[model samples]
Target chain A: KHQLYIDETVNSNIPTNLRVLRSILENLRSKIQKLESDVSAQMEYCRTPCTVSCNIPVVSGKECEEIIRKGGETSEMYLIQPDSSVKPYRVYCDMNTENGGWTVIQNRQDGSVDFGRKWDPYKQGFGNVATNTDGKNYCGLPGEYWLGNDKISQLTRMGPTELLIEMEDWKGDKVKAHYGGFTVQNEANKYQISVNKYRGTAGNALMDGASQLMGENRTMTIHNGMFFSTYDRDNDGWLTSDPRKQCSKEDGGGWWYNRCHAANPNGRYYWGGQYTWDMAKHGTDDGVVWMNWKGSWYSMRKMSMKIRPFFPQ
Target chain B: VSEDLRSRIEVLKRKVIEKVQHIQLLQKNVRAQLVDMKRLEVDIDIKIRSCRGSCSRALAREVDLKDYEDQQKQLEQVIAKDLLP
Candidate 1:
């Protein structure tokens, strides 16, 4: 029953408030449909894999590898749009990681920029694409960047997205975490996150909640199915408790902190892989951590998070 | 060797059962979200339907929009805050 009217293109006949409300209302409907289909796919995956939308000029391709390999181009910036409307946005395409062709969402290195931002900044994203002295890529320049929450939600919803998380520490350990069915709700849901089917070297840091593991905030819930929380916004479910307050304030980053975190790549970077100071607050280091691999205290040296289509093989 | 293969089948069964539980929980979470959104849509449709003629219609449209944006915020703060987790 597609009964509601849509006049988003401004036919000159439609009123202004009508136009705006109509567009937003339809956008809401779009999101509802997206969730419906997504949950359907997730539930139906036992029988088969998720294989999936769109309008406008099609813009420059959305998937990284699909675009680069098609044009014979290397990893670089290219304007990409997930579907209809607006201009194509630019993103650094990784042509070297794994099989190449990943869209980097968050990158942390050298701590050149602060990750402990408020809700709005994290919503729209921050940082730039640049490499550091340590290395390039969780999946890019050593610099820090978050390819905006809105854009990321589109990227994942456009297809069956897979997430790649790469992390390293002070010693000499490099680890990669892979998860299938990575999906993030749009800002309306505070960019809620969910990922399934984990197979990675970095440990199931997102889902395991790190119970029985030292240096982890075991009292808190796991990271999956959690809402993103920043310093200014208290979306995490820790209601009125001593010591366990806003997760973002001490974690020093925006994330899907259940009560706090099992993994927070957007956290403060501490030298020597040790952030001994903050541990007094929660009995956990909470610095740039991936608990199962390195656990607490050892603030990981460098990390990056990227996404691409998931094709199980 | 035959014992090993039988044990492997049992392990596979365990994995599938684990998946069944996971999807079932996720289904509840997502379906709840969809129903909340569906009801919100009806409330909006009813609000904007009362508009009449140009000037008065504009006010109704504005009223609808102001309420719509506020509910969008509420969706984030209340519905999503509770259900998404």
Candidate 2:
């Protein structure tokens, strides 16, 4: 009887143990299956090709010739040299002309340009004509200040650097224009500037050199460089298309003739695009002509202005 | 003999129950981590697309990629050792 009882107990315990072990094993199997599925999905994602074209040259230690040669057919590309001491030079082609060869976009390693004086709202025209100290009305203030021999040279030499010109309208309201200039060298070792199209909130009138104040048009003069206009303009040289139309009010748009306003009117304006110079002439002025962001020409003394200096990396 | 068998089985049952519960918790945690990773991947991709032309922008993108890559490595290890086991 004792032996039978022992055998029965052992047999019952064996089934219970088996049941617990089986449950544990089953749970492990399910977990393993899920893990396998998850890993496979992840691996598949890894196998997919990257969506962004990552063909930027990352290798260092190559000359200008080597960079141009290897950059082949691709414009707007960069070659990072091994030396981290100097900034990497960018290679790009002039999109306006046919088959323009690659040009190196380097910062002016020689020196920088200074606007010479802080933008004086008191001297320039901000309020009544009586308050204008420069004797010139606000309409032609920017032109006279920036279109002279020394000022023009200073502006052109600073090319490849970004620019932010500050000005005030007849009502003393603040207006600003942002520009990027690309400096190209000629055979005479003379540097020419190619100004990028205008982007600001002042309006198409500002970009086209047509001022809304009493129909007076102020032009940004192109002195030593070619002006490249990216926007369409009318025969009278007013910007036909507004680049700021798509921008938000906070970004400097939403009103007629006002678009591309700086996100913060009070902050220091910096260059956000590649600065380049154009080879074609778009104005009649030989030494100094009124130029806009769109390459339109006007009289230099037609607009009030303040110039700021920019240094490139 | 029967008493010994009963005690041994009871101990094993307790251990197995605890182990199963622990594994389930680990699995849940790993799945949660994966969701977070997917979110990060999407955000990183958007940044990469906008940072196309400039090298400075590209450097910023690489920093984000490294962060996500590190997270991936950690998650992979956890899945392999803890969850798989």
Candidate 3:
């Protein structure tokens, strides 16, 4: 009886074990096939060329104005409207210039927004127009139009490690700044801010001022020279020694300050002591503080400027 | 006897798992490469289109469109000849 039981048990156990191994192998094969297919799909897509032309107007003018038109296209070259919900804007590159850039112009379409109209970065907001000034709207914010909600949302969703990968300098170079959210000590107020340095050519202007404000103890004296010298170093020409030539060709392409403007008289003081009597009382100021494509730090009121998130394609 | 058979099966299972794991790792790399290729393709297209209306001789020479086609062919060859069965 013992021998019969042992034989039966061994007979059943061997097949069962064999079956289990077979099942595992089958599952691994299935998974491997799925992964292969996924990779293959991506490869197929990668092989295709993206020939979709941008459909937006490329307006040419002075530095600031020209930069606004250039800012119409995303880093991926897709034409984006500050307020895409109102009407879709279409831009097309009709000509290439000697500068290794395209002459993108407004392609007339039936349902397109007019590119000639002056857009109010303060009131109209970038992605969504503000119904009321509850400090929640992205209006009057530097980098609002360029970064927009799409990019910001992606940044907020990503982990710090991933953000470091996503955050690139304006030149498309990798930035080596610390990642994560932190509270910035600015003057008498503590401001919650995230450190992001990806803005291509506008990299330093993006977060350098805020960083300096926090590092320097947020004194009025330090804030005065922060915006001018930082942007001027790149030849943005926003706040040159001569105000009349500020936006001229000789001033350099203030293109980094694309689509930026003054918010309100109360909020305008942040453009540095240059534009406000209260700030000027500290000393003789240049009265040349201007907003750029990145965040503004002169006026504390502008600190609450909504960050429009941007993600690279 | 059964014990020896089970041991043999375990070794086979481990080998299969290891092989599949390696393939999966390779697939992951291929996926990342594919994404990078897609991004490069877009950049090249933008460069080409941007060179449409002006003195783009220098730009055109610098951005050799043929290089893109050659790279594409090389990627396909690598996938077909080495990556796949």
Give fnat (model 1). Answer: 0.00
lDDT of all predictions: 0.62, 0.30, 0.28
Error of 3 at A109 (Å): 15
Please provide, for model 1 over A128-225, each residue's C-alpha lDDT reduced to its tens digit, 9 standing for 90 to 100: 55322223322123246777788888788887999999998788789998988799999999889999978878888887887445544564658888
Tell me how far the alpha carbon of residue A19 in candidate 1 is from the true structure, in angstroms, after superposition.
Answer: 76
Tens-place lDDT per residue, model 1, B1-85, is 3677457435644554464444445434544443456444432322222111101221121112344445445333322211110
Q: Which stretches of candidate 1 lie over 4 Å from their true place?
A: A1-60, A131-142, A214-219, A241-244, A278-286, B1-85
In model 3, where do residues sit more than 4 Å from their true spots?
Answer: A1-313, B1-4, B55-85
Candidate 2: tens digits of C-alpha lDDT, residues A79-171:
433245535532222112123232222111100111111223211211111112143332111011112222233334533444444343223
Q: B1-85, model 2: which lDDT tens digit per residue?
A: 3677467545645555575456546555654544444443432332243232211222222213344344445444443321111
Model 3 CA RMSD to the hidden true structure, in angstroms? 22.9
**Which has the better TM-score: candidate 1, or candidate 2?**
1
- Residue A300's C-alpha lDDT in candidate 1? 87
Q: Could you tell me the lDDT of residue A51 within candidate 3?
A: 28
Best by DockQ: 2
Model 2 misplaced regions, further than 4 Å: A1-51, A57-71, A80-86, A89-208, A211-249, A253-313, B1-85
